[PDB]
Symmetry: D2
Subunit: 491 residues, 4 copies
């Protein structure tokens, strides 16, 4: 049976040590500061029990068990599209993709271990042979069974998390994981790291631990949730907190340790892990661009500016941005490739270039919407003002346009305001540069590779115009994923 | 005399009808949603009593009385620059130009009536002789005498004249745009001509904020509760809103002009010119603040040495220098008005406004992106000082310069300015601090001195061999 | 057979009346201002005979005959990709896509007539029943058989317009008089393919679709000066010849009814000519992807050759030229994936996605080329001429000035020559300016899209916003040209 | 008298060794590939003799001698404005700023030596005291008295001193970048500091263009033949190239400084200041020409009342006014140099340039786009006049303003300026007419006064609740500091 929201809310009250701003949180499910977002997670779970969404939200596995599509492994392009349609439906249903780290996103990442668990073991160092690939798989199967949200914590800002003790039982780790999103709302924390030049071996740690593990403290920014859901129909729905996690002599048994000790392993295997979350981000970006275009269509129509040609071309601009996101996503899916375990993975270069295009232009596109909406964005009637005997008539006449009731202008502006002109909405704006690797990151790590050099495919045409000049074979399986993706793109 | 902050606050308790969101405000000076910004207006009066600021904030008038620099008329360039320096000083003292309709701005606008009152009287249609130019002047003099905040409401079911008699006029309708009217003394009514406007909707007058029939209807307050976490946004929200006039009575003495669509083409723009020149002063100071925060935050993190960040920060500095170039060339290439006031060059300060409104939003994104994680995710104060968390926070916020807590200091200011409702409003307001970006271009281009017969044509015509 | 470049060149000496600048052209095949681009068309034909390119360049039609792929009709996505593959090969082989209006592009557009010929005839007004659908298809079979180049002239700038109009109708034909103001390569084509787009108020006598030979009496082709360069060592691309642009003047030109495809109906001229030019737009996107590939390629080569390629600030600029090419690719591949069938069963790529692909290029290419020019530094402007490079005193200086980590020093000149021709000569500038006329421009893409109901709050983009704000088969359609647009959007949004 | 164009052309025939592309040049003054640009130099000199312009173009010194304004020392703001009006008049008179390195620009830069000669001498290393400040000044006085064009070559196989004796130095190597050198009288040798620059490459000097062992190697000439079809590009091409120095001897009298990498840090910036000011004067005029061409073409077609068109033209007009604001503000907030010259605010005109360099591409692209098909496809003159075509071209080119042929006139100038090789060189060269966008930003930000302890720090720190050339050890460093203080108060 698939986890219910009610079971989720209950599980949160587990003694987890959480700060939200200045306050200590006794129960994340009920504290006024967290409880709207927690309920968003509960609704996530209850979407898997909605009769009308069953086709999209669930699957029957080979054992005959109905399971949430968040665990669904895709081995070809048609299966990939079915998964995307799941993620898309989840975010469309949940305030138009305002919650980017629902558990379906968080858990997508575990697909990499399952696909190819052995290198995580075999490349481990400092280990005394205790880590086992089979136990990595066992943990993921356990998560899937209980529908557990495993919040990933990989990025670092010497306070980084490190091994301070090793015995026959497991490891002790001490330090800080600087970035985490929604961890106070998860069941487990998924610890990882990305390579940086000179990363010490005792900082190379991949593992999992419960959110209430003793010595774990979750320190989150203040909550931006709004009280009044009528003035703030989106920002009153909860705030997906970001924060840091402190680990004070936290013990992790070897069974839940995936890898330690190998800096070269940290060069490409973590990228492979975060690939799934990057692909998810582009789906999200597409949906956000559709929402932004759509709001410009609704507001310019209700104001009556829609038929002004100047405005027509700017709206067409917002629609084109959405189509660019869809073109990268679709193309990424068409030109995917099989991973060593035989999952099908969309093309990494195309969907990351999708992301870079979004991260580059989304500011100006939002600014366009805000500007198109004039005063209707910020200065509109509160509800009581609108329904007041003396004010109502004035408000009706100042918001009359061609298409529909005058109050629909207020309804539109409340959304534009919540998404783009509140702290809550601004958090989303900013998070986008932290939802996987930033713009500058995509471009840097792509351009360091030998297949984007004059020797590579991009040099070939320019060379002639100028008159110049299988994982069995491949020795690095996760490097091969990068090369095979350019193969597919440039053919 | 010179009004104090205390007298100001007291004056707000006058039975004015104000909505802020759903709430009715009993008293704008003490209500939890309005009192912080009220206090900012109080700070503004008290500024003119600060002994170190007296040379900058006040002049001696012809009569011998010390007057607030908001009432000073600049008759040449150096006087203009004295006034700018006053406006600049006010906004630098008051939260880095975070409050754009302080009383010095609102009242700047009255220069146009004083400079040349007559045409407002003589161009009136349908007043049967009741409106008197000298009465316009006496009102402004009155306003001067008591340091009264006349809040302008021009931009537009709009307000119309429903009854004329021998005592005054009666007005009924809405003035849909107004900023900080709940904090002002008087409302200054005006209008801009639009194609096929009627004589009964052309109205310039002044009326008290608590005039019977007047209802100020303001958006919810965005003021923050906790000044430590939010050092700027706790300081008060300059409310925007509309004003409803339910058959409101204004005497002829306090009516400046009625009835003439033609007058509403040119003369209201001459009123708002002062607001636009002030707009660029402010935009320069916002640009300077943004550049300074990019330097502080790149220097605290230690990314300021990375050549890619250098060029990004230089660009912010350059934008400030572009605001300054426009402001300075506008003052340099100004001209005398009919009554012999010196006015900055309309064309140059407005292209200056155009440039800000076209680029501000990418310049802010640049500060936000440079600041990285330090804008959304930083320690609250209690987190910071917690005996368990203090040592981790200090280690994470360490870098070359200063003390680790300065990061949070800088972070709170960036957050408040650009990542709060409160800050976002100042963002949206710039598109409504006078005429919007598309309007500057359009009102410039509809005049024939930017046509091919104008000065822009001349070099092009010579190079082309044209006539 | 398949026509040969020799056959083509011989065919140009047919007495056509051609101005190229101040000069009259006796013979396009041999005149100094035209002969190089003529030979580029000769090379196009010969490319089809190259044994190593037979599978790319040719097919066997139903009736057992080997024809050039320019005539191939693609009925599914995999056949579509074969057609794209052919257009890519042609443009890669011909100076990195510097000749945008080769015959394969011009004739691609005839597919719309073959697909669904009847409406051209049934929607005609004022022809007194003389026009037959069958005859459009017959002309096209005739063009195909002789591999004839049909250059399209549709685009235009009341009783004062100079645009082509019908001034006589009789039992034999029509007589047209006036101007088709834009034309690319017409002086080098076999036939002029005449069309028009709807404009508000267009009179019926200016709605014309037809074909006449380029040497028809009364036809004059008036082209801009030729920008071809004399020295092909200093200018290895712009010595290859100049695809002339120009207008065509028609003075009482007789066209027989057999060669008239449609007259009279302004409503027909609004979507049907968009359906003809969809094929040209799709091809424009294929070219746009290759041009981007070249721009990014040149940028890699020059930054590597100078050694600036490792500077991080430079790296991010080249990544962005690389992402642009990938943006073009993505639109192209997506458009192929979400394509649809036309009435007559052709597979067409998704109109909306490839047009948005073009808008993205048209909006950004200018900045992108500026990047390349800026990254290449002084190597664009100042480099050695060939004799300078080989001079006994200068050579030692030039080698030491042009050294760096990759290749031979003279390769910087080789790269410089290409950047200079492509982006810093008259010849390259025309191509730059032509990108905005190679199909309805950026402004047109956005306006034609937004006038349609499916981009209103009533169509698919309204739906998610309305829910978040808490608000609230060609047989069965009447206009088949319209329904292509509705089907394209449904496939894009589902 | 002031030099005449005639005397200048005669002077070109001095046996200088010039490549233009593959050809050697017998006489820059008469060769088809260079004679038109040479005549534009001759025209520069003849402007100074025109009686309707000599109040702008010349001044009387206190000896009663009429001198070309290119030599005029400005000591205050009004005098700087007269100099600027002169440079402006020159470039409006010569094909709308299409000739960026006329002699007035080249020679402006000598102002710095004259202002403060002595550090060039005193900070020299390895010259055994042979360099004398008095001889630096005498050279500039000579240049001035004969109205000689000293073309600067500074930016970098580099030129190195290979021999030092009692008469002078011998230099060997390449000065990679040079504009118009083949049309000049003297070459002004310079260098900018770069990390690890050896003393033997620190050289400031003057040598005649025809000096033995100098070869001028220029790119091919971009000049067009038909001045009807090409009214600007027919007027000559301002060649770019490198200058090869083969064991070239320079007398100590014409050496200004050698040896000191420290001197190369800021003093070269101080020389180029003046050219950078001039670049912004030129950028304003190019902006003006671009904006007016926009007004002319949209007007002649009729697109000028389409509101979307109007806003784009307003943007070109804004860009012009932005260059003018920086220009005016630089002049307003200027300062005196050690020698008493008044110099515009270095930071403000350099930011003006930055602004231009960042945006000119897009602004020119707007004009080309707005100009439509009228850019590329328009009638040649014989087409236009032909008896059969005339009627068609007139009707196609009718609109609300002026004669139909005026669209061809506007087209020809837009074509020359932005769609030919010739115009394209002017496009690319913008980025070389002084330190490029990247350089302005980078050497600004390495200066301590743009840090958090300088005036940008002040407002930020407060809102965040945080916390005379005699005194100065470096006169050329002091100018920068003074420039910022004047801009920020």
């Amino acid at each position: 049976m698939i986890r219910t929201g009610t079971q989720y809310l209950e599980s949160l009250n587990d003694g987890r040590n959480v700060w939200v701003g200045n306050e200590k949180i006794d129960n994340v499910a009920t504290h006024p500061k967290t409880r709207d977002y927690a309920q968003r997670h509960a609704d996530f779970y209850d979407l898997h029990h909605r009769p009308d969404l069953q086709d999209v939200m669930t699957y029957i596995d080979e054992g005959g068990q109905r399971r949430a599509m968040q665990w669904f492994g895709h081995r070809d392009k048609e299966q990939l599209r079915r998964k995307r349609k799941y993620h898309e439906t989840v975010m469309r249903e949940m305030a138009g993709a305002s919650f980017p780290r629902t558990p379906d996103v968080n858990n997508y990442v575990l697909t990499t271990y399952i696909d190819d668990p052995a290198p995580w073991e075999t490349q481990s160092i400092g280990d005394d042979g205790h880590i086992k690939a089979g136990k990595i798989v066992d943990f993921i199967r356990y998560a899937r069974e209980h529908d557990l949200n495993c919040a990933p914590q990989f990025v670092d800002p010497s306070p980084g998390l490190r091994v301070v003790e090793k015995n026959e039982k497991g490891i002790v780790v001490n330090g800080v994981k600087a970035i985490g999103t929604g961890v106070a709302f998860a069941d487990w924390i998924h610890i990882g790291v990305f390579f940086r030049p000179g990363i010490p071996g005792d900082q190379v740690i991949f593992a999992a631990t419960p959110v209430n593990t003793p010595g774990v403290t979750i320190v989150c920014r203040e909550s931006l949730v709004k009280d009044d859901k009528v003035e703030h129909p989106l920002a009153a729905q909860g705030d997906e907190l970001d924060g840091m996690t402190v680990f004070e002599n936290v013990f992790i048994p070897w069974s839940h340790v995936f890898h330690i000790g190998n800096p070269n392993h940290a060069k490409l295997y973590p990228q492979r892990v975060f690939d799934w979350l990057h692909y998810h981000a582009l789906i999200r970006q597409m949906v956000r661009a559709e929402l932004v275009a759509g709001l410009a269509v609704l507001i310019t129509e209700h104001i009556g500016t829609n038929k002004i040609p100047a405005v027509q071309t700017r709206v067409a601009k917002l629609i084109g941005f959405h189509q660019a996101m869809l073109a990268h996503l679709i193309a990424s899916e068409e030109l995917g490739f099989h991973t060593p375990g035989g999952h099908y993975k969309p093309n990494i270069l195309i969907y990351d270039f999708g992301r870079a295009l979004y991260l580059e232009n989304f500011s100006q596109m939002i600014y366009e919407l805000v500007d198109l909406s004039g005063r209707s964005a910020l200065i509109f009637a509160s509800e009581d003002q609108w329904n007041d005997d003396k004010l109502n008539g004035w408000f009706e006449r100042m918001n009359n346009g061609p298409v529909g009731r005058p109050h629909d202008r207020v309804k539109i502006g409340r959304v534009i305001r919540d998404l783009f002109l509140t702290d809550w909405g601004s958090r989303l704006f900013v998070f986008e540069n932290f939802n996987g690797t930033p713009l500058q990151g995509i471009r840097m790590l792509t351009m360091q590779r030998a297949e984007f050099s004059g020797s590579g495919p991009y040099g070939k045409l320019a060379r002639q115009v100028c008159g110049i000049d299988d994982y069995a074979k491949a020795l690095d399986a996760a490097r091969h994923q990068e090369e095979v993706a350019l193969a597919g793109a440039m053919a």
